[PDB]
Amino acid sequence: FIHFSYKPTSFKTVLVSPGLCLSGDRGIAPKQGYFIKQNDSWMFTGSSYYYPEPISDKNVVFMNSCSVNFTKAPFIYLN
Amino acid sequence: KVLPPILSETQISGYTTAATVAAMFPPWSAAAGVPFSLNVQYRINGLGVTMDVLNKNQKLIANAFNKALLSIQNGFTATNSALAKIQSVVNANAQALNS
Amino acid sequence: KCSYVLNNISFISQPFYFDSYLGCVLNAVNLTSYSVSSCDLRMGSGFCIDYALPSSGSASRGISSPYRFVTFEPFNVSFVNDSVETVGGLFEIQIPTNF
Amino acid sequence: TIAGHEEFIQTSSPKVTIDCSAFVCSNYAACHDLLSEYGTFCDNINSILNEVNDLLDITQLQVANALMQGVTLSSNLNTNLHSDVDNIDFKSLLGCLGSQ
Amino acid sequence: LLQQLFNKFGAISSSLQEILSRLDPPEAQVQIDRLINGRLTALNAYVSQQ
Numbered sequence: 001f002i003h004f005s006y007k008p009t010s011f012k013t014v015l016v017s018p019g020l021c022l023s024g025d026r027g028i029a030p031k032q033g034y035f036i037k038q039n040d041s042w043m044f045t046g047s048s049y050y051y052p053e054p055i056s057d058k059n060v061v062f063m064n065s066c067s068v069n070f071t072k073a074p075f076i077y078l079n
Numbered sequence: 080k081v082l083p084p085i086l087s088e089t090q091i092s093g094y095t096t097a098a099t100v101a102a103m104f105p106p107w108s109a110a111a112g113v114p115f116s117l118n119v120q121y122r123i124n125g126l127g128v129t130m131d132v133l134n135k136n137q138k139l140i141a142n143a144f145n146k147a148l149l150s151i152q153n154g155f156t157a158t159n160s161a162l163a164k165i166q167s168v169v170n171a172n173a174q175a176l177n178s
Numbered sequence: 179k180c181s182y183v184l185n186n187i188s189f190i191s192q193p194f195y196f197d198s199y200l201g202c203v204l205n206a207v208n209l210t211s212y213s214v215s216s217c218d219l220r221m222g223s224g225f226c227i228d229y230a231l232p233s234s235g236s237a238s239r240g241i242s243s244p245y246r247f248v249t250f251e252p253f254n255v256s257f258v259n260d261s262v263e264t265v266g267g268l269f270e271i272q273i274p275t276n277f
Numbered sequence: 278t279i280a281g282h283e284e285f286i287q288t289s290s291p292k293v294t295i296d297c298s299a300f301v302c303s304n305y306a307a308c309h310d311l312l313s314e315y316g317t318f319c320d321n322i323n324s325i326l327n328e329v330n331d332l333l334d335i336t337q338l339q340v341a342n343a344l345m346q347g348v349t350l351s352s353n354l355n356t357n358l359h360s361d362v363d364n365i366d367f368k369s370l371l372g373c374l375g376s377q
Numbered sequence: 378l379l380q381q382l383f384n385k386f387g388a389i390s391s392s393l394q395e396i397l398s399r400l401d402p403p404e405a406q407v408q409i410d411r412l413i414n415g416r417l418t419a420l421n422a423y424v425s426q427q
């Protein structure tokens with residue numbers, strides 16, 4: 001059997017958030033990725049490649065509540 | 080005679096210590112890249128439990144985890160199944176060597 | 179013990195001898211601070227025997243043995259120099275930029 | 278609530294080695310002479326036992342490889358300081374780890 | 378397995394040619410029987426290992 005694998009070669013050190021607390025005390029969590037901060041704006045990136053992209057309903061899972069250590073971000077009512 | 084294994088027992092204990100500590104701390108290799116309690120939340124939510132109840136009762140979930148670990152630890156007393164399975168291996172080897 | 183070996187078993191000349199966890203080793207140097215990830219002569223309980231050929235550049239005027247008694251350690255963990263607590267609410271993690 | 282229960286799985290056994298000649302003919306030269314005409318029974322016993330022990334060693338290395346495949350740790354980790362995350366205590370499950 | 382045809386197993390010789398060309402029919406049976414027993418034991422052990 002010949003197995004092919006994805007191998008990373010270069011790395012970067014990023015500060016990430018595992019969830020966000022929105023207005024109405026709602027929550028979002030990233031769907032196989034992390035929330036990063038670029039130019040004082042929250043953003044999404046995948047976990048196996050560094051590529052910032054806008055937060056939309058494809059990247060997140062919505063929650064009618066918010067966890068006790070999600071990061072408070074009232075600026076976001078984005079796409 | 081009985082030969083020693085090629086890896087010692089402190090080595091295997093270090094391997095399981097590494098595998099346990101890889102789920103708690105912030106590379107999170109053995110916990111799908113998310114923190115531990117978030118992994119427990121998503122895993123319970125995949126059974127049909129809503130996110131509101133899990134966001135409310137996080138302290139009770141952590142207390143039940145601590146209680147289950149303590150009940151595991153205080154329970155290796157003479158009627159366990161795992162201790163019987165461990166001692167059957169040693170008894171069988173000693174019986175074969177004496178026979 | 180090496181006293182039992184050099185007294186009640188052998189009486190022939192042996193310059194290299196030392197006691198170890200596995201027993202008495204002859205014709206080998208004690209080098210258990212050194213580690214080996216792939217060995218061909220595995221002795222048990224985490225140790226191994228390596229073979230070091232003395233070549234032309236390192237002319238051993240004072241003699242040694244070409245056999246070294248080293249530590250067998252076949253598996254490791256990758257390490258990062260990141261932090262284990264939150265740096266102001268966020269976690270410090272390493273993400274690939276090329277593959 | 279949350280329930281917990283444990284389970285043992287056996288992955289190894291003791292590694293028995295046998296000196297065939299000392300077992301059969303203890304210290305006597307006439308017995309060793311009579312056993313020398315049986316040829317290759319003792320060598321066959323030793324070779325089968327070496328095969329069994331090699332299988333034991335291979336499975337031990339496979340278990341250890343499964344445990345350690347793909348885990349990346351922090352170099353600043355210390356099980357004296359770090360034994361707790363999110364009010365869950367893991368001190369009874371961690372051994373010693375860290376550079377001290 | 379082929380090396381078991383050259384053990385004596387307690388007989389005077391491992392070759393049946395050298396037994397049958399040297400002994401009486403009543404005294405060749407005692408020598409042939411030991412070779413038969415040793416070779417059947419070797420075949421039994423081989424079949425168990427397979």
Ligand SMILES: *[C@@H]1O[C@H](CO)[C@@H](O)[C@H](O)[C@H]1NC(C)=O
Binds near residue numbers: 196197198209210
């Ligand atoms: C062998 O070397 C180690 C360290 O290199 C040392 O701790 C140990 O005592 C030595 N053994 C003997 C018998 O001197």
Ligand SMILES: *[C@@H]1O[C@H](CO)[C@@H](O)[C@H](O)[C@H]1NC(C)=O
Binds near residue numbers: 252253
């Ligand atoms: C860890 O083990 C691997 C096994 O191949 C080896 O290549 C590597 O050099 C080791 N690293 C350290 C720091 O011991």
Ligand SMILES: *[C@@H]1O[C@H](CO)[C@@H](O)[C@H](O)[C@H]1NC(C)=O
Binds near residue numbers: 259352
């Ligand atoms: C790497 O770790 C050392 C201490 O172990 C620290 O002094 C140093 O600043 C770290 N380097 C980086 C780039 O974080």
Ligand SMILES: *[C@@H]1O[C@H](CO)[C@@H](O)[C@H](O)[C@H]1NC(C)=O
Binds near residue numbers: 010275276277
């Ligand atoms: C990735 O690596 C390849 C070859 O190593 C290089 O040609 C390419 O420019 C790299 N890309 C980035 C984004 O670093």
Ligand SMILES: *[C@@H]1O[C@H](CO)[C@@H](O)[C@H](O)[C@H]1NC(C)=O
Binds near residue numbers: 069137
């Ligand atoms: C939230 O963060 C605080 C800050 O250290 C910590 O003490 C607490 O255990 C965390 N709780 C959860 C549920 O993550």
